[PDB]
Amino acid sequence: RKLCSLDNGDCDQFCHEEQNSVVCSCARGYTLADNGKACIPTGPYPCGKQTLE
């Protein structure tokens, strides 16, 4: 358990070890946050989210 094998590399969604070291990415409709880890929704109904309203 090193990079992406160690807690998804701390990413919210997609994780990839690019030449050693983690690189996170997000599904369509989300944008990688400043931390380069969190995934921020673009619209009101982002994919994969249960609706609370």
Coordinates of N, CA, C and O in Angstrom, one line a residue:
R1 N 0.8 -1.2 0.0 CA 0.0 0.0 0.0 C 0.9 1.3 0.0 O 1.2 1.8 1.1
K2 N 1.2 1.7 -1.2 CA 2.1 2.9 -1.4 C 1.4 4.2 -1.8 O 1.1 5.1 -1.0
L3 N 1.2 4.3 -3.1 CA 0.5 5.5 -3.7 C -1.0 5.2 -3.8 O -1.6 5.1 -2.8
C4 N -1.5 5.1 -5.0 CA -2.9 4.9 -5.1 C -3.5 3.7 -4.4 O -4.7 3.6 -4.2
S5 N -2.6 2.8 -3.9 CA -3.0 1.7 -3.2 C -3.2 2.0 -1.7 O -3.7 1.2 -0.9
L6 N -2.6 3.2 -1.3 CA -2.7 3.7 0.0 C -3.9 4.7 0.1 O -3.7 5.8 -0.2
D7 N -5.0 4.2 0.5 CA -6.2 5.0 0.6 C -6.6 5.8 -0.6 O -6.8 7.0 -0.6
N8 N -6.6 5.1 -1.8 CA -6.9 5.8 -3.0 C -6.0 7.0 -3.3 O -6.4 7.9 -4.0
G9 N -4.9 7.0 -2.6 CA -3.9 8.1 -2.8 C -4.5 9.4 -2.3 O -4.1 10.5 -2.6
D10 N -5.5 9.3 -1.4 CA -6.2 10.5 -0.8 C -7.1 11.2 -1.8 O -7.6 12.3 -1.5
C11 N -7.3 10.7 -3.0 CA -8.2 11.3 -4.0 C -9.6 11.0 -3.7 O -10.0 10.1 -3.0
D12 N -10.5 11.9 -4.3 CA -11.9 11.7 -4.1 C -12.4 10.7 -5.0 O -13.1 9.7 -4.7
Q13 N -12.0 10.8 -6.3 CA -12.4 9.8 -7.3 C -11.2 9.0 -7.9 O -10.5 8.3 -7.2
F14 N -10.9 9.3 -9.2 CA -9.9 8.6 -9.9 C -8.5 8.8 -9.4 O -8.1 9.9 -9.1
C15 N -7.7 7.8 -9.3 CA -6.3 7.8 -8.8 C -5.4 7.2 -9.9 O -5.7 6.1 -10.4
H16 N -4.2 7.8 -10.1 CA -3.2 7.2 -11.0 C -1.8 7.6 -10.6 O -1.5 8.7 -10.2
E17 N -0.9 6.6 -10.6 CA 0.5 6.8 -10.3 C 1.2 7.1 -11.5 O 1.4 6.3 -12.4
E18 N 1.5 8.4 -11.7 CA 2.2 8.9 -12.9 C 3.7 9.0 -12.6 O 4.1 10.0 -12.1
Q19 N 4.5 8.0 -13.1 CA 5.9 8.1 -12.9 C 6.2 8.2 -11.4 O 7.1 9.0 -11.0
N20 N 5.6 7.3 -10.6 CA 5.7 7.3 -9.2 C 5.0 8.6 -8.8 O 5.0 9.6 -9.5
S21 N 4.3 8.6 -7.6 CA 3.5 9.7 -7.2 C 2.1 9.7 -7.7 O 1.9 9.3 -8.9
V22 N 1.2 10.2 -6.9 CA -0.3 10.2 -7.3 C -0.7 11.4 -8.1 O -0.2 12.5 -8.0
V23 N -1.7 11.2 -8.9 CA -2.4 12.2 -9.7 C -3.8 11.9 -9.7 O -4.2 10.8 -10.2
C24 N -4.7 12.7 -9.1 CA -6.1 12.5 -9.1 C -6.8 13.2 -10.2 O -6.3 14.2 -10.7
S25 N -8.0 12.7 -10.6 CA -8.8 13.3 -11.7 C -10.3 13.0 -11.3 O -10.5 12.4 -10.3
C26 N -11.2 13.7 -12.0 CA -12.6 13.5 -11.7 C -13.5 13.2 -12.9 O -13.1 13.5 -14.0
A27 N -14.6 12.5 -12.6 CA -15.5 12.1 -13.7 C -16.1 13.4 -14.3 O -15.9 14.5 -13.9
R28 N -16.7 13.2 -15.5 CA -17.3 14.3 -16.2 C -18.3 15.1 -15.4 O -19.3 14.5 -14.9
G29 N -18.2 16.4 -15.3 CA -19.1 17.2 -14.5 C -18.5 17.6 -13.1 O -19.2 18.3 -12.3
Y30 N -17.3 17.2 -12.8 CA -16.6 17.6 -11.6 C -15.3 18.2 -12.0 O -14.8 18.0 -13.1
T31 N -14.7 19.0 -11.2 CA -13.5 19.7 -11.5 C -12.5 19.4 -10.3 O -13.0 19.4 -9.2
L32 N -11.3 19.1 -10.6 CA -10.3 18.8 -9.5 C -10.2 20.1 -8.7 O -9.9 21.2 -9.3
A33 N -10.3 20.0 -7.4 CA -10.2 21.2 -6.5 C -8.7 21.6 -6.5 O -7.8 20.9 -6.9
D34 N -8.5 22.8 -5.8 CA -7.2 23.4 -5.7 C -6.1 22.4 -5.1 O -4.9 22.5 -5.4
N35 N -6.5 21.6 -4.1 CA -5.6 20.6 -3.5 C -5.2 19.5 -4.4 O -4.2 18.8 -4.1
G36 N -5.7 19.5 -5.6 CA -5.4 18.5 -6.6 C -5.9 17.1 -6.2 O -5.5 16.1 -6.8
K37 N -6.8 17.1 -5.3 CA -7.4 15.9 -4.8 C -9.0 15.8 -4.8 O -9.6 14.9 -5.3
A38 N -9.6 16.8 -4.1 CA -11.0 16.8 -4.0 C -11.7 17.0 -5.4 O -11.0 17.6 -6.3
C39 N -12.9 16.6 -5.5 CA -13.6 16.7 -6.8 C -14.8 17.6 -6.5 O -15.7 17.3 -5.7
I40 N -14.9 18.8 -7.2 CA -15.9 19.7 -7.1 C -16.9 19.6 -8.2 O -16.6 19.6 -9.4
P41 N -18.2 19.6 -7.8 CA -19.3 19.5 -8.8 C -19.5 20.8 -9.6 O -19.3 21.9 -9.1
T42 N -19.8 20.6 -10.9 CA -19.9 21.8 -11.8 C -21.4 22.2 -11.8 O -21.7 23.4 -11.6
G43 N -22.3 21.3 -12.0 CA -23.7 21.6 -12.1 C -24.5 21.2 -10.8 O -24.0 20.6 -9.9
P44 N -25.8 21.5 -10.9 CA -26.8 21.3 -9.8 C -27.1 19.8 -9.5 O -27.4 19.4 -8.4
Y45 N -27.0 18.9 -10.5 CA -27.2 17.5 -10.4 C -26.0 16.7 -11.0 O -26.0 16.2 -12.1
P46 N -24.8 16.7 -10.3 CA -23.6 16.0 -10.7 C -23.8 14.5 -10.7 O -24.6 14.0 -9.8
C47 N -23.2 13.8 -11.6 CA -23.3 12.3 -11.7 C -23.0 11.7 -10.3 O -22.2 12.2 -9.5
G48 N -23.5 10.5 -10.1 CA -23.2 9.7 -8.9 C -23.8 10.3 -7.6 O -23.5 9.7 -6.6
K49 N -24.5 11.3 -7.6 CA -25.1 11.9 -6.4 C -26.6 11.6 -6.1 O -27.4 11.9 -7.0
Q50 N -26.9 11.1 -5.0 CA -28.3 10.9 -4.6 C -28.9 12.3 -4.5 O -28.3 13.2 -4.0
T51 N -30.2 12.5 -4.9 CA -30.8 13.8 -4.8 C -31.5 14.1 -3.4 O -32.2 13.3 -2.9
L52 N -31.0 15.2 -2.8 CA -31.6 15.6 -1.5 C -32.6 16.7 -1.7 O -33.3 17.1 -0.8
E53 N -32.7 17.1 -3.0 CA -33.7 18.2 -3.4 C -33.9 18.2 -4.9 O -32.9 17.9 -5.7

